[PDB]
């Protein structure tokens, strides 16, 4: 039994994906619908973007991810039982699964991108989300207790693997956190701005509900979707609406998604899109055979 997985966003540039987007017929179809929905040339604004994670980059990733899933289905004759999306990917699965029309998912993605930028212009300034590895829970607790001791606010924002976690907190503690991680053999990966996945962001959650998600029409998916907050198999439009909202304030629990999938009979997984993380981490590897449906793969003969 097979599942369709949609990954989180990661580091890349237009050079990595540009030939794919302009050459693959799935993506061309989807770009046409995206342009007609936004009122501009997505490829053109993505092409000239001055960032790693602009609005335009985010919508392009949506499109690439969905087209690669449609691409893997036809190319490799996959017949998925169930699907799942991590972090950014929640938006990808919504569209793949049929919970939203592609056009609403483009609107959605675009709206939330503006909305995150407004929000974090003034709110929780200096807060950052740190990723790290080679950190068993035992060691992480010691660090957190040392943080509690100094009265410094924090929140675990993601559980990736037994020894792989994301922690959100003020950047004042970053250098110390990094140094202290390394002291016990843990390796810092990245320090992400804006931050993501914390109870203290219920304010952002409300604003995405009112300004962006509420006007949209959700449909039950054509296959069930495993929530990345806790492994819940979802089956209605309203459960997919909720996951996209809870995402701002509930931590991502990737070992729970792997659990359900295994429990629902899944032997194999196709990861749709460019992928620095969820298709490669041990949590996914040890459980399943992985097909990596990346722009590189879709440009072989």
């Amino acid at each position: 039994a097979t599942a369709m997985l949609f990954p989180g966003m990661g580091p890349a540039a237009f050079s990595d994906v540009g030939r794919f987007m302009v050459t693959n017929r799935y993506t061309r179809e989807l770009l046409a619908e995206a342009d007609d929905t936004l009122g501009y040339s997505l490829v053109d604004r993505f092409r000239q973007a001055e960032g790693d994670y602009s609005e335009y980059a985010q919508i392009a990733f949506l499109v690439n991810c969905v087209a690669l899933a449609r691409w893997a289905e036809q190319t490799m004759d996959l017949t998925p039982r169930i699907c799942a999306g991590a972090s950014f990917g929640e938006k990808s699965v919504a569209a793949y699964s049929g919970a939203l029309t592609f056009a609403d998912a483009v609107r959605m993605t675009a709206g939330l991108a503006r909305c995150m930028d407004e929000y974090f212009r003034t709110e929780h300034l200096g807060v950052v989300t740190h990723s790290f590895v080679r950190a068993p829970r035992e060691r992480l607790d010691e660090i957190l207790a040392e943080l509690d001791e100094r009265g410094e606010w924090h929140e675990i924002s993601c559980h990736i693997d037994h020894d792989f976690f994301m922690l959100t907190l003020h950047e004042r503690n970053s250098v110390w956190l990094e140094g202290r991680l390394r002291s016990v053999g843990a390796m810092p990966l990245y320090a992400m701005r804006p931050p993501m996945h914390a109870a203290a962001f219920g304010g952002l959650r409300d604003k995405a509900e009112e300004e962006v998600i509420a006007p949209l029409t959700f449909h039950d998916p054509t296959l069930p979707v495993v929530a990345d907050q806790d492994g819940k198999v979802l089956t209605t439009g309203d459960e997919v609406r909720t996951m996209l909202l809870e995402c701002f304030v509930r931590p991502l629990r990737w070992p729970d998604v792997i659990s359900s999938l295994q429990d629902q009979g899944v032997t194999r997984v196709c990861v749709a899109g460019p992928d620095s993380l969820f298709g490669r981490v041990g949590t996914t590897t040890r459980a399943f055979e992985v097909i990596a449906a990346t722009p590189r793969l879709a440009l072989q003969p």
Partner: protein, 77 residues
């Protein structure tokens, strides 16, 4: 100057370097294809193969910037 045990290992994590292209000492590993999780698995293979534990300054990104700094840093253990 490193050996073939080191380099065969290291090349299993540089997808944009071809077998017929030399591994320059000062070449930047990120541009040659090493990324976060690659680095993680690469640490792994080095710690088994060489029976060491990386730590403190050896876990900064700088260690992994080039094969030269990585070989230097590894020799010391």
């Amino acid at each position: 100057m490193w050996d073939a045990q080191f380099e065969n290992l290291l090349r299993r994590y540089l997808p944009f370097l071809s077998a017929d292209q030399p591994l320059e000492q000062d070449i930047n590993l990120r541009d040659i294809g090493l990324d976060s999780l690659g680095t993680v698995e690469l640490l792994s293979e080095l710690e088994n193969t060489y029976d060491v534990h990386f730590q403190d300054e050896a876990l900064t990104k700088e260690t992994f910037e080039t094969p030269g700094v990585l070989w230097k840093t590894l020799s010391q253990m």
